Amino acid sequence: GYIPEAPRDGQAYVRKDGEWVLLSTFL
Amino acid sequence: GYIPEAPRDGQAYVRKDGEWVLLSTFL
Amino acid sequence: GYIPEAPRDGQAYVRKDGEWVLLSTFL
Questions:
Q1: How far is it, in rounded angstroms, from Cα B1 to Cα B24?
Q2: What is the largest CA-CA distance in chain C?
Q3: How close, in Å, is residue C6 to chain B by CA atoms?
Q4: Superfamily of domain B1-27
């Protein structure tokens, strides 16, 4: 399926396990 | 909503504030 | 067109040239 927009909250997101996850978690 | 394709310019993108932003911005 | 779901495999993905690619390459 196609995935919905990531949160629009000033943060960058990456895709993991069917969810948008904060890039900062990996940095 | 659903999300348009990122640029097909050979660069990696993350999703931020309803836009595709270069991953390199944050590395 | 629209973005499809990434693999659901415990790894983080970013978008490049119409595909999902591993974030870990870049870190």
A1: 26
A2: 29
A3: 13
A4: 6-Phosphogluconate Dehydrogenase, domain 3 (1.20.5.320)
Å resolution of this model? 1.2
Tokens encoding A16: 């993991």
**Where are chain C's structural domains?**
1-27
Contacts with B, C 8-27, CB within 8 Å: 14-18, 21, 23, 26-27
Interface mutation vs chain C, best among A5, A15, A21, most C CBs within 10 Å: A15
In this structure, what is the dihedral angle of CA atoms B11, B14, B20, B23, given to the nearest 10 degrees?
-50
- Provide the greatest CA pair distance for chain B: 28
Method: X-ray
